[PDB]
Amino acid sequence: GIDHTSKQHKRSGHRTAPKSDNVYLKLLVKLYTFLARRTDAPFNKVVLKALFLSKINRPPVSVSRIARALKQEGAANKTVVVVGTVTDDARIFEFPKTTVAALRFTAGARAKIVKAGGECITLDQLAVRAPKGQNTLILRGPRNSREAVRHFGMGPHKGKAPRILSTGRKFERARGRRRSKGFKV
Amino acid sequence: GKSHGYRSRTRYMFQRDFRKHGAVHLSTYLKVYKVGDIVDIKANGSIQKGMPHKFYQGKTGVVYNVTKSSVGVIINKMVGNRYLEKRLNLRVEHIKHSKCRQEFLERVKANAAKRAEAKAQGVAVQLKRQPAQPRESRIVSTEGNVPQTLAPVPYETFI
Amino acid sequence: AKSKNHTAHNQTRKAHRNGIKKPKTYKYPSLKGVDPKFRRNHKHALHGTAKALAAAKK
Amino acid sequence: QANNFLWPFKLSNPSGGWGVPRKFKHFIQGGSFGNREEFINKLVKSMN
Amino acid sequence: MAHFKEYQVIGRRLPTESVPEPKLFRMRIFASNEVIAKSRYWYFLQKLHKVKKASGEIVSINQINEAHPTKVKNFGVWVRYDSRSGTHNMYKEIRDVSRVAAVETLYQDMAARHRARFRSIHILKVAEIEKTADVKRQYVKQFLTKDLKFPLPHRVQKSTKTFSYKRPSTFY
RNA sequence: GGUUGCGGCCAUAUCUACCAGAAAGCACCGUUUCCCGUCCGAUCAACUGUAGUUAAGCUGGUAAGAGCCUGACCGAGUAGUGUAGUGGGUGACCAUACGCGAAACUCAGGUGCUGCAAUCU
RNA sequence: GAGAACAGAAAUCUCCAGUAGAACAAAAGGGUAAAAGCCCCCUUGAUUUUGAUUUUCAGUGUGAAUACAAACCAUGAAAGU
RNA sequence: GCCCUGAAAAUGGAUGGCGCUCAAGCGUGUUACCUAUACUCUACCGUCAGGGUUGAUAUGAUGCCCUGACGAGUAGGCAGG
RNA sequence: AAAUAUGUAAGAAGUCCUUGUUACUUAAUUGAACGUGGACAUUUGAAUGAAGAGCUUUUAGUGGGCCAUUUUUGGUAAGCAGAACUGGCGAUGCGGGAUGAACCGAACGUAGAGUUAAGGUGCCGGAAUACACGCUCAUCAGACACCACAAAAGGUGUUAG
RNA sequence: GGAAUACUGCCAGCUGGGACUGAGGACUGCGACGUAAGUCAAGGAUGCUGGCAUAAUGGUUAUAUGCCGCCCGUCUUGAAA
């Protein structure tokens, strides 16, 4: 027998492929696992894994968040990479040139980018221009902005938003929510 | 029925030490505490105000707040399968500066010495601590010391 | 209809599956419950030294 | 480093046997456990 | 507890600054191997001195061999033992050819006559009785009468096979 | 070294009985107009430092002193205890193995150390 | 304990010893001696605001309590409380 | 110490049974020997892990190849069928 | 005043130098708190191990428990009732204890060879009617832990003291 | 005085009998032996010979013999009850 000291037969817990059933997605994965095995470039390992990500773990990057990054010191000529979709944002008025490589560009993102004489690029066009991902700036979007996580960790004094349907006074705002009605949270 | 009030089971715990009752000597009051200090906790029964709960007796924590008559000590208490942070408000009579740190603090300064001290000569240091090693060989003489032979002794009563 | 009243039996087995999680420790802990007079001042002090680095980048 | 490098040795049961009717007393009481000092070699060899 | 050897074991309390050269005490110990023998040593020292093995060292261990292993000898033996309801001193006489052989039969005897296991006995002294007539126990004296002779009646041959064709004879 | 004012550790400083204390200090000590408190100027307040005294306080020394403090292979590797056995025993209980290890006892040695400031044959 | 008319076992007076052998509403246990007890003097902080904390705990509530902030006061020569 | 007395219950009956007495009994010692789904080595299944391999011109890239370790299971969860 | 248990510590989130910020705090540019600039690297600060560590969501069953050693309350006691720590049974077969939930041994993929555990080796039954020293004779001998019970008290049976 | 022997330990000293296994499928490695050519027991069995070519070996099935095997489902701390 063996005094084991960890669960036997334990799966690593990381996606290994995507869960997506999409040919093209599966082809990009063909590309980057090859790239990952045969170059020592860290960039390719990162990108591989990101393609596995499910939709939640791929929040959209906005074109304004893109612009912000290019304002980094020594970064305006970097080619930014988003492994996910890139959305448009009327809140910025002046958008720079650059080259963005992503899985998806919305109609208006592509427009904004292209109208500033930028360039929208797929991840595989990206691969051929930069096999070691040289000169690249990988941006991820905000994961914990999602409406769902408003309610994670609900409990007294945790300050975290009821799962509630209708809202207003008269919906979960009395006993336990104020000093004068039993107690507060 | 059962009884579980604040100072329950504490009869001997908060008692006062044989022939050590009365005023607390002024040095207790002259000592100084700074945020970050490490203190051991132990209740003075004669000081009822600002008193640690019995759980925290013999427990050691870090000072996080310094107030007019007291210090705030954070202690990590384990409840269930986990620790929670606890912040105590202790008066200075129930706290003392911990020595749990001197053999380190005094060793750090020491390390810095023989580090620079050696280095300047031309290195070869070794300043990690090492456990009791086993004994090396040795020769024991007999001179003035021939071995005395003992046996076991018969059973006997004396009573 | 009497029954077992109480026992710790098997409880530390349970506490130790997932582990007794050591406390977790941060640089910069909270100032929760630290003297408000101190904090009020500490606030302006920081305002001050920050100013004097923006200033040192003129 | 040297000794961690070696996997734990996986031995068989002693081929001679254990020399004792009952293993789970100390070596000193005609049993098998504890420090048996240099007599460890005869065991290990019979188990190796 | 086994087939005995006899050891000199020598030990002392560990040295100190204010006391280098501690005193040095020896015991003769009957045990089957040196591990049991050094253990027995500490056992008995801790009934005599402020020591334990954690604060002492064995200085020497040395097996003592019988001086005349083929000279028959009358041994006086002194023992302390524990019974079920009390503890007790005893004197036995054993006749064999080595202290070692002597001690093996003692433990045997103590086990058989008194039900004393090895844990319950203390050899206090084992010594060769020089002149006869200080030999005191009859079951031995018997064997030192002049020109001693005796038959072994009722001889019992061991068979080698399950069937015999004769009918044995116990003659001798 | 003494002494004083303020101390730290709070009996090696306490307790009982004796004896010794130069110089300064402290003290006891004189007074009752004033502030002030009392049944009572004993305490407390003020005034003198003059009129008097080492008697007490105080400090120190003595004592096969009581207490306290320290040490010790003194007792004791004892009591107790963590771990082991298809060990003993009807049992109560007990021995052994690998470790940890007291208290009383007994004997010896002690009997305030010390900070800041002023002062003194 | 040793003393003083009526005065006795016990009334009121004085001196000596006195580590608490008393007293502090109450059960008990802790605590306390120029006090935490007893006598006297002045009082209303047993007040105002709203947070943090400890026990019980789910780290909910309630009860009780702790240390601060911001007021206004009390007492004391004062530090303070 | 062993043995004996002390020692009384219900269908006939249990050191497991037979039976055993310098034991096949009791205490103790020494060897040898028997045998678990356990230990050691090896093959094969499956699980988990770590590597390697898009290069046409032939057939599974969820593939193919190398390597290591692991495998009890009610209630219950998930997975591939 | 133990033993067993138990809090904290063994560094880069560390140590030392210089001297900025404030309304807090000091008699005071005093401190306090947070900082800028500078100096020292894997024997950087004990051992052993680490099929890695951290983190998030959501949901099942469960919420009658029972047993063993040790500690332990009530009770004359109980295969009784109740707690402490661990280990088990429940949920688990396998070898041993004849038999048996919980004891001993040992935890399970399908198999070959070997060696063992606990326990055995007259015959049932695989395995010495092996060796060795004693003791024991029972007209109700005795025979292996848990375990399937025996006591006070007696013997000029016999043994050794 | 001078040896021998026992005991314990060591040898990268030699050597006999017996059992199970033979996974892998060009080469590729680390070596060993040779002056060399070459050889080898060095990253997993080949050589030589015989018998049958069929129910012979093997499957299936009935039976017999050794040892083993209680009635499932259920609630239950605990079910063959």
Add this chain to the structure above:
RNA sequence: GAAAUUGUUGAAAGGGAAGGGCAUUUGAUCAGACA
């Protein structure tokens, strides 16, 4: 035109149930592979 259940025929076993597991003998039966 299933099964429970039944008649006949054939074969087999059966000292207070029967059925089951590992293994082989015996009988009956059968696949494959050889050139």
